[PDB]
Write a protein that binds this ligand. Structure first.
Ligand SMILES: [K+]
Ligand SMILES: [K+]
Ligand SMILES: [K+]
Ligand SMILES: [K+]
Ligand SMILES: [K+]
Ligand SMILES: [K+]
Ligand SMILES: [K+]
Ligand SMILES: [K+]
Ligand SMILES: [K+]
Ligand SMILES: [K+]
Ligand SMILES: [K+]
Ligand SMILES: [K+]
Ligand SMILES: [K+]
Ligand SMILES: [Mg+2]
Ligand SMILES: [Mg+2]
Ligand SMILES: [Mg+2]
Ligand SMILES: [Mg+2]
Lengths: 123, 195, 184, 173, 128, 270
RNA sequence: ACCCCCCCCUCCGGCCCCGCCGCCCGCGCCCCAGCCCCGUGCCCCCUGCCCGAGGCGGCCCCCGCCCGGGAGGACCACCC
RNA sequence: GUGGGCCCCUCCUGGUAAGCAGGACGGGCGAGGCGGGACGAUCCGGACGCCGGGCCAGGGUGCGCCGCCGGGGCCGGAACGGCGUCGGCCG
């Protein structure tokens, strides 16, 4: 946490995965942002960097807010690495400022299998 | 990660229960005080017959395996909340362990800040002609042993806090005189720019 | 309509006070209070008159104003003149034996139909009972609250009962003959 | 949502009928397709001309001015589960279309009759002295006043987002 | 024992619909569920609203029985009641609900830090 | 089908389970109710059952067939050497029932009471009340803790022990029991009375009176593992039953598919 | 109101007081109305995001058997 | 290979009737994954290679449990009864 130490944030919660009553998709997390009670009021937090703290090792996972959900201020997010079920009910930080974390906020299928036709170069 | 303390005077049982259950599943600690002053709509007699019909259901061959029916308002509220939680999982059990429910206000909560939930209070929910009753009285009819004790304790503490508020009045008149910290005015103006 | 209302005059002798549907009336005989705060009411007091109104009726809400006005009228009759109820002890071959006890605050009844069991009836607070000073086998219930006087008289009535017989033949009991105000 | 249409139609001409007659009707419909369907309904039942044997000449659509409150008396017939009945209703609205929405919602609610269950005989403006129903004529008077009939609704609506508060709000009246 | 009434010339604050957050003046009374309203010096077209959206103010503006848009406007401009409504406490809260309405994400960051040192200054005082 | 003839069930289900007692001795569950204004008295005492005999008494009933005649009656003799009052407890009536305030003990404690604190006396090293006696040598401390009880407790009981060196019994440690102080004019008079009793003996004649009525509480005679005929009183089956006539023949219908708690079975009796 | 619920009465996880005698944790108190609603239709909105000790509320710890008799008993246990 | 079928919708025959028995056009299960109808071989949608994004049918949107608000009304079962409440027609 020695990089995001001084960074102030808006609070959020990880409530669950995207699901129906039959199926559950662990690629996308459902997230609640305080003060956001309307679908239209999600524009301002849309596309923003977010993070969660995984207890073990004390380190954060970085991610981005991608899309609204419902009529009531819920959002979808994709994290660098999909999340464990243990982390439900925990807090999420929405950063007010900018941080360059490079490639470390983007999901794994987009990182690899994204098709730039990345030829394995072998030097 | 504070606690939310809710004063259950005035509120509808099912509507407050739904709120508390969702709040618990978001990883919040919640206490509820004055559970015998919560409200169930309908005639008191209809409520009474409903709770006695509930009480008739027990395991035929051994009643120690059966549903247990609690008689105090706090545990009635707690059973109603369990009805809305998935408690047989680890997640549901953690949500349960985060709750607390009380008859009256005990000293462990006597200095917390209470809040209300007006969208679940009966004076906003029920039509003026609808009958209504409070949980304490149903509990007294089904077997709760401690109505008079809670009333004596409530009387004493209300008198004590009525004394306290008189000092609180003047203590605020000193606090409020802090219209003389310009290191605060120099930013109340900034607050105003945005409000 | 949008409203339903009834109005009545305030007699000059009494004083009245209204506060959040709590009515207090006061004159010579006493001071009497009622709460009508179990109903939605608009009770307006001005210019020496009382009006009771209900906005947006839809049903039995149209049945309220005449009731709250009638109850107030009793609350005037009782504070000015007072109510008395005159009861007759009827019997045949077994004289009912009635005494007044607890300093006029209770009635005691013996020998209904030659019975060992004795009946004690206490007067609802504010009421008094006196044996008739004019004609025999008559009781006088007196008070400023019609509710209390009538509940006491009815209480004697269902106290004195004859079991397992034809009531159309065995006619004994203590029945209300006169209901009314006082006459000084 | 209702809109006002005038529909002109006729039987398709034959050798015995050079220039058949012309019929026009006023229709209150959600849109043009339903309006022409209802015109064919009526001209089939009344003048024995099906859609197959005739042609619609026009479906004019009329917009209306508002800004003032009028009385509309509507004479209709509907169908229930025991038979057919005739009915009169009065409403206070700004335009005929809005008055007809009010009528349709009130039938759906108190009679449980749907749109294709109901045929409208007459729709006309009714003068103030000319009115005949209480819930209408009440408001046809000068100086009508009443306190707000449901001020709890504002408080509940605000609570829907102010889920938690530090006191129970009042209800100003 | 009420004090605010539904009647011609009553000022209302619109609490729901497309015109949420504005003031208007009642011109006519349809039934116990609907009114015809018109506010032309706030930006409201003449229209029928449900009483469930209109929060009754305490001001009654003198008008004629059936006015027109521009003449109603001139009646309003004659009356001083909107000015008093703004000077009252409620109107002040409305004015500041209009500068806190148009906020962006950087603005929320600013306001949040500022609220932090309000909390801290009030504590550094209240501890004498 | 229905049972063809009518017959009640065997035994009382309000005395379940039929397990051995775990309480050590008879323990007084309830005390008689306090009457604000009544004269002060004690309510309970502890004795040891000694024997039975019979007496001849002149009956002075009225309306009875024994009105002016003599009857022979059974009587039970209970032996009650005087008890010693050693401590005071106060409780309060709270939204959670009776909760205690504090227990104040006597300055000097006797051998039987000390012995009830230990398992084997001659071997265990003796550090009971070692600090208490030193602290409480001066009586001021007891005065203030009594002050606390007086200030706020709602019921008062005294803690008293029996004295078995005055019996033929075999044990040496006392039986310790609370006797509730009922009656009086207020709480503080009861606390004063308890202080006056502290460390003294108490005789049973100053608790009970002749002709009054009492309740006796103890633990019944033991019989070990017993069958249904003796434990529940069910009928014995016919002589030509193949494997035993000391049983219940049917212990349940097919449904429900479990044995009910209302069926008689074998186990601990007494 | 032989009905129903509570008391008495039976079992009873847990807890409390008292004997011999250390740890940890948190920082927030008007009340009462809604057909007087007494001037409302707000606050909070940073649990680290820079907060951090008294008083007031919580938490953990704390205690032998064998051996022989018995009013106890299949063995155990129980009371001495 | 098969020559034991069965069910739905409409139309029928015997029978008091039946989750009874016997016939007819079309469809389905059989031999059809997936979602919904709490739960079901056949009902409502849609009939299938392995994945990523988007749109959405049928059913629904207090909490369990993914998803909402605004508006206008009212507040299993037969013959036969109801001065409960809201609406009409005829005199
Ligand atoms: K049988
Ligand atoms: K049998
Ligand atoms: K037997
Ligand atoms: K069985
Ligand atoms: K059994
Ligand atoms: K048995
Ligand atoms: K057995
Ligand atoms: K029972
Ligand atoms: K009993
Ligand atoms: K047959
Ligand atoms: K197939
Ligand atoms: K097929
Ligand atoms: K009817
Ligand atoms: Mg044999
Ligand atoms: Mg078949
Ligand atoms: Mg399913
Ligand atoms: Mg949900």
């Amino acid at each position: 946490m020695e990089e995001i130490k001084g960074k102030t944030f808006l609070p959020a919660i990880f409530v669950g995965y995207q699901r129906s009553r039959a199926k559950q998709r662990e690629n996308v997390a459902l997230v609640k942002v305080s003060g956001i009670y309307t679908r239209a009021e999600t524009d301002k937090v849309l596309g923003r960097l977010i993070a969660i703290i995984h207890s073990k090792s004390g380190k954060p996972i970085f991610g981005k807010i991608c899309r609204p959900h419902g009529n009531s201020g819920m959002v979808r997010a994709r994290f660098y690495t999909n999340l464990p079920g243990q982390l439900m009910g925990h807090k999420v930080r929405v950063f007010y400022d900018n941080i360059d974390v490079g490639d470390r906020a983007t999901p794994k299928y987009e990182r690899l299998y994204g098709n730039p036709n990345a030829t394995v170069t072998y030097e | 990660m504070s606690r939310i303390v809710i004063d259950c005077k005035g509120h509808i049982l099912g509507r407050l229960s739904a709120i508390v259950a969702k709040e618990l599943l978001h990883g919040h600690e919640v206490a509820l005080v004055r559970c015998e002053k919560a409200i169930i709509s309908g005639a008191f007699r209809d409520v009474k017959a409903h709770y006695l019909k509930k009480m008739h259901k027990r395991t035929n061959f051994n009643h120690l395996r059966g549903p247990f029916h609690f008689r105090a308002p706090a545990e009635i509220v707690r059973r109603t909340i369990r009805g809305m939680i998935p408690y047989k999982t680890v997640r549901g059990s953690d949500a349960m362990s985060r709750l607390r429910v009380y008859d009256g206000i005990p000293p462990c909560c006597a200095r917390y800040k209470r809040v209300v939930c007006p969208s679940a209070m009966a004076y906003l929910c029920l039509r003026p002609e609808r009958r209504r009753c409070e949980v304490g009285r149903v509990a007294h009819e089904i077997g709760w042993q401690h109505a008079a004790d809670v009333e004596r304790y409530e009387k004493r503490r209300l008198e004590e806090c009525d004394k306290w508020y008189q000092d609180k009045i003047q203590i605020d008149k000193k606090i409020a005189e802090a219209a003389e910290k310009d290191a605060e005015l120099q930013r109340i103006n900034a607050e105003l720019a945005k409000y | 309509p949008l409203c339903s209302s009834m109005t009545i005059k305030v007699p000059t002798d009494v004083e009245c006070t209204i506060n959040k549907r709590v009515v207090t009336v006061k004159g010579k005989k006493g001071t009497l209070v009622r709460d009508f705060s179990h109903a939605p009411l608009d009770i307006t007091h001005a210019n020496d008159t009382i009006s009771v109104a209900v906005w947006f009726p839809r049903g039995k809400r149209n049945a309220l104003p005449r009731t709250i006005c009638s109850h107030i009228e009793n609350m005037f009759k009782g504070v000015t003149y007072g109510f008395e109820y005159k009861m007759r002890l009827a019997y045949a071959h077994f004289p009912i034996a009635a005494t007044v006890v607890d300093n006029n605050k209770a009635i005691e009844i013996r020998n209904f139909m030659h019975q060992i069991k004795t009946r004690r009836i206490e007067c609802l607070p504010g009421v008094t009972i006196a044996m008739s000073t004019n004609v025999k086998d008559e009781l006088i219930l007196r008070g400023i609250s019609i509710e209390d006087v009538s509940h006491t008289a009815a209480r004697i009535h269902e106290s004195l009962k004859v079991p397992n017989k034809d009531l159309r033949k065995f006619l004994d009991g203590c029945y209300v003959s006169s209901r009314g105000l006082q006459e000084q | 949502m209702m809109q006002k249409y005038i529909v002109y139609g006729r039987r398709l001409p034959s050798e015995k009928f050079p220039e058949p007659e012309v019929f026009r009707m006023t229709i209150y419909a959600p849109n043009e397709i339903v309006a022409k369907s209802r015109f064919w309904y009526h001209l089939k039942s009344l003048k024995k001309i099906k859609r197959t044997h005739g042609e619609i000449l026009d479906c004019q659509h009329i917009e209306e001015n508002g800004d003032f409150v009028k009385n509309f008396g509507v004479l209709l017939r509907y169908r229930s589960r025991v038979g057919q009945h005739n009915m009169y209703r009065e409403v206070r609205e700004t335009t005929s279309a809005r008055a007809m929405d009010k009528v349709y919602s009130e039938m759906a609610g108190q009679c449980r009759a749907r749109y294709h269950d109901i045929q409208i005989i007459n729709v006309k403006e009714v003068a103030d002295e000319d009115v005949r129903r209480e819930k209408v004529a009440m408001f046809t008077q000068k100086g009508v006043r009443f306190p707000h009939p449901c001020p709890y609704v504002h408080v509940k609506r605000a609570a829907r987002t102010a889920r938690f508060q530090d006191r129970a709000p009042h209800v100003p009246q | 024992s009420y004090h605010r009434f539904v009647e011609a010339g009553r000022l209302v604050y619109l609490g729901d619909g497309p015109d949420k957050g504005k003031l208007a003046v009642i011109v006519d009374i349809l039934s116990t569920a609907a009114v015809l309203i018109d506010g032309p010096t706030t930006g409201v077209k003449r229209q029928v609203v449900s009483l469930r959206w209109a929060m009754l103010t305490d001001q009654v503006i003198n008008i004629s029985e059936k006015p027109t848009t521009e003449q109603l406007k001139k009646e309003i401009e004659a009356s001083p009641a909107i000015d008093t409504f703004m000077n009252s406490v409620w109107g002040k809260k409305i004015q500041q609900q209009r500068l806190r309405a148009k906020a962006t994400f950087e603005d929320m960051g600013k306001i949040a830090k500022l609220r932090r040192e309000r909390k801290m200054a009030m504590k550094r005082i209240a501890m004498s | 089908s229905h049972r063809k003839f009518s017959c009640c069930r065997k035994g009382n289900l309000g005395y379940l389970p039929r397990k051995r007692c775990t309480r050590g001795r008879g323990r007084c569950k309830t005390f008689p109710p306090d009457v604000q204004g009544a004269p002060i008295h004690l309510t309970a005492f502890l004795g040891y059952k000694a024997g039975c005999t019979h007496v001849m008494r002149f009956i002075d009933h009225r309306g009875s067939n024994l009105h002016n005649r003599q009857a022979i009656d059974q009587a039970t003799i209970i032996d009650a050497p005087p008890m010693i009052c050693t401590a005071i407890i106060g409780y309060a009536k709270t939204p959670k029932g009776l909760r205690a305030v504090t227990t104040v003990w006597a300055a000097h404690i006797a051998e039987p009471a000390m012995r009830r604190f230990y398992r084997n006396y001659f071997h265990a090293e003796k550090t009971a009340f070692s600090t208490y006696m030193k602290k409480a040598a001066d009586g001021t401390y007891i005065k203030e803790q009594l002050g606390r009880l007086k200030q706020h407790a709602d019921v008062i009981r005294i803690v008293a022990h029996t004295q078995p060196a005055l019996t033929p019994l075999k044990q040496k440690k006392a039986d310790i029991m609370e006797i509730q102080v009922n009656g009086g004019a207020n709480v503080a008079e009861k606390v004063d009375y308890a202080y006056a009793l502290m460390e003294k003996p108490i005789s049973i004649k100053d608790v009970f009176s002749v002709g009054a009525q009492i309740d006796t509480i103890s633990i019944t005679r033991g019989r070990g593992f017993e069958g249904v005929v003796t434990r529940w009183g069910v009928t014995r089956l016919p002589r030509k039953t193949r494997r035993g006539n000391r049983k219940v023949a049917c212990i349940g219908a097919w449904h429900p598919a479990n044995v009910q708690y209302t069926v008689a079975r074998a186990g601990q009796m007494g």
